[PDB]
Swiss-Prot record, chain A:
GO terms for molecular function: rRNA binding; structural constituent of ribosome. Located on the platform of the 30S subunit, it bridges several disparate RNA helices of the 16S rRNA. Forms part of the Shine-Dalgarno cleft in the 70S ribosome. PROSITE patterns: RIBOSOMAL_S11 (PS00054). GO terms for cellular component: ribonucleoprotein complex; ribosome. Belongs to the universal ribosomal protein uS11 family. The gene is rpsK. This is Small ribosomal subunit protein uS11.
From Swiss-Prot, chain B:
The keyword Ribonucleoprotein applies. The gene is rpsU. This is Small ribosomal subunit protein bS21. The keyword Transferase does not apply. One of its GO terms (cellular component) is ribosome. Coiled coil: none annotated. One of its GO terms (biological process) is translation. GO terms for molecular function: structural constituent of ribosome. Belongs to the bacterial ribosomal protein bS21 family. Keywords: Ribonucleoprotein, Ribosomal protein.
From Swiss-Prot, chain C:
One of the primary rRNA binding proteins, it binds directly to 16S rRNA where it nucleates assembly of the head domain of the 30S subunit. Is located at the subunit interface close to the decoding center, probably blocks exit of the E-site tRNA. Gene3D superfamilies: Ribosomal protein S7 domain (1.10.455.10). Belongs to the universal ribosomal protein uS7 family. The gene is rpsG. Part of the 30S ribosomal subunit. Contacts proteins S9 and S11. It comes from the Bacteria. Pfam families: Ribosomal_S7. Keywords: Ribonucleoprotein, Ribosomal protein, RNA-binding, rRNA-binding, tRNA-binding. InterPro entries: Ribosomal_uS7, Ribosomal_uS7_bac/org-type, Ribosomal_uS7_CS, Ribosomal_uS7_dom, Ribosomal_uS7_dom_sf. GO terms for biological process: translation. This is Small ribosomal subunit protein uS7. One of its GO terms (molecular function) is rRNA binding.
Swiss-Prot record, chain D:
Signal peptide: none annotated. Keywords: Ribonucleoprotein, Ribosomal protein, RNA-binding, rRNA-binding. GO terms for cellular component: cytosolic small ribosomal subunit. The gene is rpsR. Disulfide bonds: none annotated. Belongs to the bacterial ribosomal protein bS18 family. Binds as a heterodimer with protein bS6 to the central domain of the 16S rRNA, where it helps stabilize the platform of the 30S subunit. Part of the 30S ribosomal subunit. Forms a tight heterodimer with protein bS6. GO terms for biological process: translation. GO terms for molecular function: small ribosomal subunit rRNA binding; structural constituent of ribosome. The lineage of its organism: Bacteria, Bacillati, Mycoplasmatota, Mycoplasmoidales, Mycoplasmoidaceae. This is Small ribosomal subunit protein bS18. Coiled coil: none annotated.
Amino acid sequence: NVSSGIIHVSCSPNNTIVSASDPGGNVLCWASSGTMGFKGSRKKTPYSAGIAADKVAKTVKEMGMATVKLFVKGTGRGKDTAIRSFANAGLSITEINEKTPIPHNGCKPPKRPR
Amino acid sequence: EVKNDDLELALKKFKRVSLEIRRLAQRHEYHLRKGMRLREKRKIAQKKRRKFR
Amino acid sequence: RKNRAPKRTVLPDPVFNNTLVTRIINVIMEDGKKGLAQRILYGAFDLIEQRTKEKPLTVFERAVGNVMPRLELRVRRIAGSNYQVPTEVPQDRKIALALRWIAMFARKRHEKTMLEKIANEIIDASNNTGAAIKKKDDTHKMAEANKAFAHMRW
Amino acid sequence: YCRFCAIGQLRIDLIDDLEALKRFLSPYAKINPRRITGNCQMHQRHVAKALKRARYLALVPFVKD
RNA sequence: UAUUAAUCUAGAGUGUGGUAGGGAGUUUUGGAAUUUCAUGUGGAGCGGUGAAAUGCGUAGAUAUAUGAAGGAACACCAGUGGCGAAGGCGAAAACUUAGGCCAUUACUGACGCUUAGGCUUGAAAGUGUGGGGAGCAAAUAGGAUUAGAUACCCUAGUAGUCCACACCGUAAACGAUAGAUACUAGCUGUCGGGGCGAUCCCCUCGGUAGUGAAGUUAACACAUUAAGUAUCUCGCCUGGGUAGUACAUUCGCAAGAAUGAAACUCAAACGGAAUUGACGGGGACCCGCACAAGUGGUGGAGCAUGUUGCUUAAUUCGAC
């Protein structure tokens, strides 16, 4: 709803989630690469992530976000296609933010993929 | 990482340090022993040093 | 480790003064002999021009241009699943596939002499009546689905 | 490329010389390695401890990217 | 020489002055944030793999930002870096202090040297003791898959990883290279210290490295930091499988540690390394309807041959 909100993009080893929020910590709309139904290796494709992020980009373009804050999160095949999906949908890139946390073994992650 | 005011140029200079920090965090997101971590890290460091010297 | 080897074709036919007609004659060539195929294609063009009243050559070239393919596949597996690398295929194979599709879809009717049905199929492929145009459309659409598998190198 | 003991003072605290430290710094919580600035062991101690000390006192981004 | 009677420094070293190590410990916080709770919005997905599923979501998610709490560990700096007795030392900040690097006819005048016995320390699992436990994984448990998963996949997940105490005191603590000691072509690097001087270059000595001479391991190679050279002291060592078994003895309730035969049996060792190859289920170069790109048939129909097989009086026999 704000003139410049955020659309946070998370790239989990399977899926690409795009969630559009106001800066006051209020997500007003959402999409994901599981919404259109692709599962596994297909929803990790750049096309799936781009189509998932284009939906939130357009709907925030109409509902009040002319531009957006470009928060990139994670690494993968859909980490940056979301950014261009936002850009082409009217959300010009005011700035980019790679706010990925850098932990220091504050946990013990479970068994590592093989 | 933050590179502002440009859609592609500052973003192009962004992506380098962006992926650097992303990989730096990624190699800290799984439990492992000091042995393999240090051995591989110093192997890469010595590879870069020999390529440099 | 075979390198690039050039493709070969034959001379045009005076009915159209084009190589596509002669290549269709080659493909539809039964008895291994091209006289019967040449007669079949001549009658086909006559029945093309007497149906819908349109000039046979532009119809035939529009058919071969709208059946036009644009892809070939290089298969590769990761661990238990095989995907595709879209590769640029030489134009010789492109026109060959177009003409072969025309020829194969020309004779898939059993009602009369082959002449009328081959003429009707050439007309249909020219007027984009789905017999092989759908293949081109599907290749163009899946060119936005297999490039994802082409991007990552597993 | 040696940097400290030529532009520094051999006694590096945060104040009065923070710019030579920030030269191996960015607001991104990183320090230039020896491949860019090949300072010796004591100069590397200087830059490491002092820069993470400025991060520690909330002068420059501790981990913040 | 073992001894005695004295001295001299140069071995032990000590003194002075310059003098550095993520040295240890002690004492603090700071953050990436992990998890949880409330503020909320969101309106059907999240999640995981090689593949999905299990699992999580509609007491309002995915996710997001604030605030608050509890635990864990500290992005870069991290070094042909230094130090610490090995064990090890890296978010920073302080203190006690071991010890270090440089040069001292400087001082006792051999005070030396090691080390069976002996003293101390000793990653860690895992033991119980008190907290929180943020997270997860031994074990355990479901869905896969499998010829089967408590193996490789994940979710749930405890001991534990965290800390305080002991004990466990073993490690790839192995450089499979002992400690003290003195010496051996160089060369190219680094760090620290001393001198010097825009920096610097440079010299000195160590530390930290290497190719390689000489020298030395069958060989692989080490090589001024030796596996080179030599003195004092100690520990380990004679065939395999038995076997570190079996016993005795012990340290700790707790997990473990030293320990040491032999019966029987076999000529070496799933032996070591210079040499050759295929494989790669680690990889690499170059040709090849070998593949694909395709074109047509066959296995599906019929037909003749050829074969397997059965059979009798042969269904001849070799070829598979």
